[PDB]
């Protein structure tokens, strides 16, 4: 069930991320992570750790936001797995 919790929290990091990311990126010349929408696309593929590179942070706080988003993705992922694992182990104890 904490995996469920993980999903909620993630979706929140996915939004706060998109936000901060644009907030952090504007002002730094050449930055492309400056509009709310694609920002969100950016966070989604960075969380899924797929990161095509069509968009990437260039500032320090932008990268920090980045790191956090990465970890919410790499964690939820693991937590859903760790969950699944347990379910099958219990199911199997029969």
């Amino acid at each position, epitope marked *: 069930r904490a995996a469920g919790a993980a999903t909620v929290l993630l979706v929140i990091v996915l939004l706060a991320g998109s936000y901060l990311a644009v907030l952090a990126e504007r*002002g730094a010349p050449g*930055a492309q992570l*400056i509009t709310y929408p694609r920002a969100l696309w950016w966070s989604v593929h960075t969380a899924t750790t797929v990161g095509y590179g069509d968009l990437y942070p260039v500032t320090l706080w932008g990268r920090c936001v980045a790191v956090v988003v990465m970890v919410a993705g790499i964690t939820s992922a693991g937590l859903v797995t760790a969950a699944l694992a347990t379910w099958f182990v219990g199911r199997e104890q029969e």
Partner: antibody
Amino acid sequence: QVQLQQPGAELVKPGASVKLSCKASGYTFTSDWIHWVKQRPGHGLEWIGEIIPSYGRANYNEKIQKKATLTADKSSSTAFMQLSSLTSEDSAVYYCARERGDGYFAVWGAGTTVTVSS
Amino acid sequence: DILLTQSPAILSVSPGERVSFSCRASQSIGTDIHWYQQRTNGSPRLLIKYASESISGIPSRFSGSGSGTDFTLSINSVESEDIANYYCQQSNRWPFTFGSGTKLEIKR
């Protein structure tokens, strides 16, 4: 309805500093960015700076000599630009537009004619 | 910072004719180009957004086109009211930037 309301004009003595206003109404959002474009008579539009009211962060145009300082009054929904120590060169029409965070300037203001003279 | 070049500065066209203004980015900016129209003593007015998307309130006469570095604003059948100044502006890379503008003149 006329969303961005800007004072028709301001006269300013060389060296002095004016504080232009822009009071918005209509659909406001936390993702809202208020911009400032300066158009010298007979010339093109020139980005001056931008500000995100729901946070107060402000960035300016790095090529032009900074002669402005953006601020936003959370409650009264008004954006203020502080153009200090002016000169004939600063004399122009200043607009303020609202940007939803998607890149384009949806709506602009009427513009505040500023004339720097004695 | 991206440089939007707008040539020519003036366009002389006959009524009801089809006119096209071009904006060229110093580098690829996708479709993140937007066009504003400003008349004599008027403010800018969003015409097209994202190179080719409609804005409620703008004649269907106006259309957008292009991607990457070359974009084209277009008016199918010019008309007295369309006399103004046309500027393009990108929002691909910070800071946003404008074009030099293009004056449209009709030939009555």
